Every structure is written in structure tokens, then in C-alpha cells.
Design a protein around this ligand. Structure first.
Ligand SMILES: CC(C)CN(C[C@@H](O)[C@H](Cc1ccccc1)NC(=O)O[C@H]1CO[C@H]2OCC[C@H]21)S(=O)(=O)c1ccc(N)cc1
Lengths: 99, 99
């Protein structure tokens, strides 16, 4: 779809068999979820944002459905205040900015 | 223009008579710059992101030019690792997401 920005651009996700909502976030390189339970191996990773850094688990090659569109990629798990879909996934679903 | 997301969506800004680059950030409610010098009164404000919170100065009714488009609104000043154009300004320039 087209999404305007009068409200936070939140969409419905399916990831690791679980349903979540997440913010379409063009300012995020990476995709990060709080409180999902993903299978298999992971590596610790530190991420930097406003306010400092955060420790996350990095999972690779994770399938995700983003507003009905399929992608696969890295998903970070850690204490984000809101789940975010970043550019690593947005490029796969053909998401663009327009003005 | 249309901007794809294979690279960070960075654009050229003019704000407070100064030139900067900033990230088009749909995941930011607010617009925040590091190291600009804005005129007049301001209020302290705390902002939350990944990694915790940040103290900023809030300036109201600040003109900005974003990739050649005019807007006016709140601009936060504080130690962000990258300057960000948030939804408060993006709505004024007619920015949308599309996929
Ligand atoms: C829902 C939040 C994440 C909103 N953030 C905007 C977000 O786009 C920024 C944009 C941004 C970019 C770099 C540094 C700080 C913030 N942050 C971000 O943390 O991305 C992180 C996830 O992937 C990595 O790639 C970029 C940093 C990592 S925020 O910077 O904390 C923020 C929150 C409120 C306002 N008004 C302005 C900015």
C-alpha cells in the first residue's frame, strides 16, 4: 500500500510463527523486536541509537511476513521500546519514500 | 523525489541558516539535530530511543528546507548520532511510504 505519516506507520508482522505489530522505520538499518522467541543459533550484538547502546541477540536468515509481503533476513531481539522493520527488510518488499 | 532504501535516505537540509544532512526517518516522531545553533527560547525535553533516553533542547516554530521543500515545526537539539527528520516535518512535505 501507500502509507502516510500522520500516524506512526505500524503494520502487522508474522515472524517465528508469532504475530506482532512493528513500525516501518526508514531510519533503522536493522530490524529489531522485543519479546519474540526465535529458533536456533544467535550471536550477541551491540546496537547504537538515541540514548546509547543496546545488547541484542542477532538471528540470521529469519523469514518474516510484513503487511502480507514475504522477506528473509537478520532479525535482532532485544529491549527496543517498539518493534521496528528496518531497511534490511524494507528493500526486500520494495518499500520506497516519496515526496 | 522517490527514494529507495538500499542506502540510508539522507537528504540536504537548511535550518537556522546552516546546511546539514539528515536521515528521512519514518520511525521518528520528532526531528532532531546534533550541533546546530538555533535562535531564541527553548525548553528542556527528554526523548527515548533504543538504548535509553536523551536530554534535548526543544525549539518551536523553526523553518526548515528539506531537499528543497519548506516546512516549519519543532526541532530538537541534542546528542543524536545522526540528524533525523521525523514525521512532524515529513507530513508537511507530503512524504509517504509505498510498497
Ligand atoms: C522508534 C525509535 C527507534 C525512533 N528513533 C528513530 C530511529 O529511526 C533512529 C534513527 C537513528 C539512527 C542512528 C542512530 C540513532 C538513531 N534509530 C535507530 O535506533 O536505528 C537503530 C536500529 O538500526 C540501526 O541503524 C540505525 C541505528 C540503529 S529515535 O532516534 O530513537 C528517535 C525517537 C524519537 C524522535 N523524535 C527522534 C528519534
Amino acid at each position: 500500500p501507500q502509507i502516510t505519516l500522520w500516524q506512526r506507520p505500524i503494520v502487522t508482522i508474522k515472524v517465528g510463527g508469532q504475530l506482532r505489530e512493528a513500525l516501518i522505520d526508514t531510519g533503522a538499518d536493522d530490524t529489531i523486536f522485543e519479546e519474540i522467541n526465535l529458533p536456533g543459533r544467535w550471536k550477541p550484538k551491540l546496537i547504537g541509537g538515541i540514548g546509547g547502546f543496546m545488547k541484542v541477540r542477532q538471528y540470521d536468515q529469519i523469514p518474516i511476513e510484513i503487511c502480507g509481503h514475504q522477506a528473509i533476513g537478520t532479525v535482532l531481539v532485544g529491549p527496543t521500546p517498539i518493534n521496528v522493520i528496518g531497511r534490511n527488510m524494507l528493500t526486500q518488499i520494495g518499500c520506497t519514500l516519496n515526496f
